Amino acid sequence: ASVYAWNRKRISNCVADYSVLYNSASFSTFKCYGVSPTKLNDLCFTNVYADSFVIRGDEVRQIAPGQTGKIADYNYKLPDDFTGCVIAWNSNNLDSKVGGNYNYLYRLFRKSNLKPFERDISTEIYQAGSTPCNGVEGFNCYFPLQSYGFQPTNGVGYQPYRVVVLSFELLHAPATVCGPKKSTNLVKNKCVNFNFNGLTGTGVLTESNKKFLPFQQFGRDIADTTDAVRDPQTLEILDITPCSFGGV
Amino acid sequence: STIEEQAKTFLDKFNHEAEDLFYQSSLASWNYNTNITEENVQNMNNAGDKWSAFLKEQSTLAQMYPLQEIQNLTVKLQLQALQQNGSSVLSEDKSKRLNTILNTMSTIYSTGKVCNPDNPQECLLLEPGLNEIMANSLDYNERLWAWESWRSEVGKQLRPLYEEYVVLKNEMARANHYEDYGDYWRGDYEVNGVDGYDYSRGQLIEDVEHTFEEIKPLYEHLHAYVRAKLMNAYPSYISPIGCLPAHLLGDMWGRFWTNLYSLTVPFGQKPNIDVTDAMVDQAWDAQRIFKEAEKFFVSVGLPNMTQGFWENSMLTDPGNVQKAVCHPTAWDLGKGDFRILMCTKVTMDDFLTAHHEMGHIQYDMAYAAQPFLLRNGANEGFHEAVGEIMSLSAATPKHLKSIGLLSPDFQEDNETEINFLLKQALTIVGTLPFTYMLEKWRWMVFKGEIPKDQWMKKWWEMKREIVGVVEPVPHDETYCDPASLFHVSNDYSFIRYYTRTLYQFQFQEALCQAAKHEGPLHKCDISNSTEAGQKLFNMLRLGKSEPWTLALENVVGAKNMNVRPLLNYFEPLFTWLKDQNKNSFVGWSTDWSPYA
Numbered sequence: 001a002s003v004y005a006w007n008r009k010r011i012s013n014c015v016a017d018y019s020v021l022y023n024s025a026s027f028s029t030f031k032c033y034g035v036s037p038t039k040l041n042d043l044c045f046t047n048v049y050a051d052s053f054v055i056r057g058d059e060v061r062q063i064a065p066g067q068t069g070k071i072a073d074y075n076y077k078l079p080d081d082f083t084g085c086v087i088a089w090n091s092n093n094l095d096s097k098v099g100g101n102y103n104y105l106y107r108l109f110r111k112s113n114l115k116p117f118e119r120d121i122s123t124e125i126y127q128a129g130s131t132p133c134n135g136v137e138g139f140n141c142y143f144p145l146q147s148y149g150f151q152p153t154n155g156v157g158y159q160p161y162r163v164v165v166l167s168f169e170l171l172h173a174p175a176t177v178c179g180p181k182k183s184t185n186l187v188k189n190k191c192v193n194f195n196f197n198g199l200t201g202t203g204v205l206t207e208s209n210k211k212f213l214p215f216q217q218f219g220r221d222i223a224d225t226t227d228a229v230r231d232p233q234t235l236e237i238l239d240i241t242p243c244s245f246g247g248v
Numbered sequence: 249s250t251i252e253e254q255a256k257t258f259l260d261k262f263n264h265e266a267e268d269l270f271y272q273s274s275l276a277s278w279n280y281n282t283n284i285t286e287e288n289v290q291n292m293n294n295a296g297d298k299w300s301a302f303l304k305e306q307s308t309l310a311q312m313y314p315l316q317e318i319q320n321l322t323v324k325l326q327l328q329a330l331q332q333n334g335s336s337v338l339s340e341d342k343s344k345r346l347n348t349i350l351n352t353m354s355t356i357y358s359t360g361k362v363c364n365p366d367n368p369q370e371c372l373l374l375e376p377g378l379n380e381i382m383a384n385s386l387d388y389n390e391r392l393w394a395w396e397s398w399r400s401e402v403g404k405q406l407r408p409l410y411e412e413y414v415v416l417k418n419e420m421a422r423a424n425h426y427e428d429y430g431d432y433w434r435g436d437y438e439v440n441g442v443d444g445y446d447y448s449r450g451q452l453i454e455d456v457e458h459t460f461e462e463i464k465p466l467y468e469h470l471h472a473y474v475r476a477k478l479m480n481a482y483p484s485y486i487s488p489i490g491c492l493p494a495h496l497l498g499d500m501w502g503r504f505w506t507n508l509y510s511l512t513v514p515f516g517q518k519p520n521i522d523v524t525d526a527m528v529d530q531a532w533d534a535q536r537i538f539k540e541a542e543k544f545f546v547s548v549g550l551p552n553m554t555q556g557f558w559e560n561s562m563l564t565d566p567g568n569v570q571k572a573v574c575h576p577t578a579w580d581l582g583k584g585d586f587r588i589l590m591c592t593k594v595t596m597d598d599f600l601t602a603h604h605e606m607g608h609i610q611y612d613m614a615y616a617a618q619p620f621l622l623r624n625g626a627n628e629g630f631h632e633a634v635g636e637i638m639s640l641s642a643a644t645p646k647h648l649k650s651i652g653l654l655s656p657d658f659q660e661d662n663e664t665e666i667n668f669l670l671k672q673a674l675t676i677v678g679t680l681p682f683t684y685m686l687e688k689w690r691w692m693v694f695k696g697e698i699p700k701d702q703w704m705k706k707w708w709e710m711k712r713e714i715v716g717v718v719e720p721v722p723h724d725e726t727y728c729d730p731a732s733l734f735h736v737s738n739d740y741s742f743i744r745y746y747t748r749t750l751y752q753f754q755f756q757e758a759l760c761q762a763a764k765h766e767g768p769l770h771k772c773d774i775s776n777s778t779e780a781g782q783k784l785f786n787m788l789r790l791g792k793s794e795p796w797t798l799a800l801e802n803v804v805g806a807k808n809m810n811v812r813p814l815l816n817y818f819e820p821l822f823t824w825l826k827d828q829n830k831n832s833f834v835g836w837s838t839d840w841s842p843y844a
């Protein structure tokens with residue numbers, strides 16, 4: 001969609017890998033605000049809504065928290081202290097056609113500055129002066145919606161850069177999408193520290209004869225001591241015992 | 249509820265609309281210069297009419313805005329140019345006389361004819377036929393006929409047409425609240441709205457004339473020396489007491505005296521500064537010729553060239569059916585699209601021309617951030633002078649040895665520098681009197697206080713006095729030779745060339761001083777100097793947003809037109825010329841002797 005008709009979608013309850021994004025070797029203005037890309041996977045937040053639109057290469061910098069301008073003020077406003085990342089890459093080879101790609105429109109005028117995270121679609125027209133416009137364009141009507149021109153021979157600054165926006169916020173709800181925490185292969189008959197899904201400890205991992213019902217995760221015997229954990233990647237229950245220790 | 253905000257709203261709307269139409273028109277023009285087809289010319293009218301018609305509609309809308317309440321100067325200049333009525337003031341019956349007259353004269357000038365009367369053997373166009381027979385031959389008899397082959401076969405029919413052109417183009421000045429059509433061209437240099445920095449339209453004439461008093465003494469010795477070397481091949485055919493014939497100045501109009509190298513070589517014993525055989529030995533091509541120019545620009549400090557030109561523009565002559573002209577020109581299509589149109593060749597001039605072309609392209613991106621209306625030079629002279637400063641540095645031996653085109657061991661003696669400096673003066677200093685007189689003739693003739701009969705007698709009198717040329721054969725008033733020149737005939741302001749010399753050298757001294765180069769200016773270089781690049785970039789990016797007069801103060805600090813930093817470049821040459829002209833008759837008065 002175009003900048004004046006940017007979409008807001010919902011993504012939740014799954015796992016997304018941002019590591020592949022970093023080494024995509026295709027992004028030109030991968031910028032993160034309020035969070036480093038490296039620590040974006042270990043910790044996860046809610047409100048992972050995403051936005052998609054097309055922005056010309058020259059005015060890419062306008063899309064940033066605390067940054068105003070034409071697109072940032074009349075088309076899409078980013079709130080201050082924005083917690084998220086913006087990914088942009090060139091799309092010359094496909095987002096362009098001979099004679100000019102007159103398919104993307106943008107807002108050139110507005111009665112008031114756009115508030116952060118506001119979607120504005122309208123047919124009305126601007127009032128430059130005092131005489132109202134009754135739908136007929138005149139000396140002070142200035143139909144705000146103007147179509148972009150993206151020719152294949154346009155300069156790099158004027159090239160239409162394909163850009164998307166990712167945002168993260170807080171809510172009183174369980175955490176939404178996170179990253180996969182690179183589960184490591186197990187080892188048996190060794191005093192090895194373990195960190196399963198939620199619980200962690202140190203002990204010797206051995207075979208077990210007891211049978212768990214299909215809805216348990218870990219087991220304990222006495223005094224809230226965990227001694228039987230079923231790994232999720234194998235669905236096999238294994239005993240846990242503290243390894244050798246004592247006085248000498 | 250104010251005019252200032254309303255004007256800003258309109259300008260923003262116009263900027264996005266105008267650039268879109270301009271880009272579509274600009275790209276169409278490039279193709280016609282690379283692939284000419286019978287349908288391409290038909291395409292021009294479809295694109296041209298709407299683009300021109302677009303400005304007409306916008307100009308009317310901008311007229312109702314009063315100009316007495318816009319304190320802002322950025323939009324004040326923009327509204328001034330957008331409100332130029334131009335041909336709108338002319339009536340429909342009178343307006344149709346513009347295109348009808350303009351196009352007919354264009355076709356007439358494009359007809360090359362050197363076929364001998366009563367002897368129709370053959371004759372080619374202007375470029376192949378006219379230039380070769382005058383720039384190479386050394387025969388007085390045929391050259392005189394060649395002089396008459398164009399001033400009596402092409403300009404004769406322009407007398408009833410040119411006169412009609414200046415009577416109706418002079419009327420629009422009153423409708424445009426201007427003094428005359430000549431004064432209209434002076435509006436480019438006019439500055440208003442800034443206290444102390446205002447430049448009156450009439451201030452151009454006095455400033456141009458004031459700087460001409462110091463040019464003449466240099467020209468008196470230059471003309472005295474150049475004429476002395478002309479009688480070596482003509483000891484007695486021309487008397488050494490008057491001026492020189494018009495048809496012995498290299499070109500038909502004598503604008504450039506480059507062709508006089510063979511006849512007037514200062515010291516031909518030692519080899520000249522030529523690297524044509526050097527580059528062919530190393531197998532240079534179009535890509536390498538331009539690439540070495542690009543790294544020269546970035547070394548100075550300016551941003552390097554873009555990426556959408558090598559694979560977008562054309563360098564050599566493509567194909568065989570494509571006969572489109574490839575004259576060296578600068579293309580500014582807008583929206584980040586920039587191209588260069590020229591035919592690469594293994595020649596000295598083309599190598600220098602390559603460095604000259606990128607100068608205009610570099611200036612285009614400097615004011616890219618400026619709006620579409622202000623996306624232009626400060627005045628008509630700035631755009632040309634900016635593109636020539638590097639050409640002077642590119643010809644210096646120091647720059648050539650840096651890349652390796654010149655031999656590693658090339659001594660720099662007295663004669664080596666005088667030979668190089670003198671030729672630059674001929675094509676720069678030599679053409680200054682010719683530029684000034686022609687523009688002065690255009691101003692006075694457009695004023696209207698000149699009867700028909702004395703159009704031509706006054707044209708010749710000052711040429712013999714200022715330029716110093718004797719008429720090869722008397723001509724009566726019916727002839728219209730002054731209208732045969734390319735720029736004057738096709739309605740181009742020739743004053744820009746006169747200011748080109750005064751602008752290129754003023755910046756050269758400032759840039760050379762910024763580089764802290766030790767030595768004379770002729771040996772100065774601009775590369776490997778980041779400080780000089782920053783100084784140039786500061787004024788280039790201003791564009792038309794700031795007054796042109798303010799630009800000068802940012803580089804040389806002199807608000808007026810300073811002619812002093814032009815003799816300094818030729819001080820080694822001037823001293824030698826004075827000694828060489830000890831016996832030559834320096835200083836010519838009115839002279840009817842050669843053709844009494």
Ligand SMILES: *[C@@H]1O[C@H](CO)[C@@H](O)[C@H](O)[C@H]1NC(C)=O
Nearest residue numbers: 182183184185232233234235
């Ligand atoms: C997912 O379950 C399949 C079921 O056989 C198993 O083969 C696979 O190893 C599991 N994934 C991981 C990462 O262990």
Ligand SMILES: *[C@@H]1O[C@H](CO)[C@@H](O)[C@H](O)[C@H]1NC(C)=O
Nearest residue numbers: 282283284285286569570571
């Ligand atoms: C070039 O021009 C020729 C004829 O002038 C035409 O047949 C050909 O299609 C043109 N090619 C391009 C790429 O414009």
Ligand SMILES: *[C@@H]1O[C@H](CO)[C@@H](O)[C@H](O)[C@H]1NC(C)=O
Nearest residue numbers: 256318319320321322323324
């Ligand atoms: C005029 O307005 C422009 C708006 O961008 C501003 O940049 C400039 O400084 C203003 N100049 C004056 C003299 O008010």
Ligand SMILES: *[C@@H]1O[C@H](CO)[C@@H](O)[C@H](O)[C@H]1NC(C)=O
Nearest residue numbers: 311331333336337423424425
């Ligand atoms: C331009 O033409 C319009 C319409 O005739 C007129 O109102 C206006 O005064 C003219 N402006 C100039 C500068 O000639």
Ligand SMILES: *[C@@H]1O[C@H](CO)[C@@H](O)[C@H](O)[C@H]1NC(C)=O
Nearest residue numbers: 542546551552553554555556
């Ligand atoms: C221009 O310089 C930049 C900065 O070093 C570089 O990335 C780019 O490739 C250069 N472009 C050309 C055409 O040399």
Ligand SMILES: *[C@@H]1O[C@H](CO)[C@@H](O)[C@H](O)[C@H]1NC(C)=O
Nearest residue numbers: 646647649650651773775776
């Ligand atoms: C400029 O610097 C380069 C890099 O050292 C050098 O190769 C070149 O000869 C220098 N040119 C001049 C004129 O100093």
Ligand SMILES: *[C@@H]1O[C@H](CO)[C@@H](O)[C@H](O)[C@H]1NC(C)=O
Nearest residue numbers: 659660661662663664665824
């Ligand atoms: C150049 O001229 C000066 C002044 O006469 C003289 O001293 C010097 O030797 C000359 N140099 C050469 C190389 O002729």
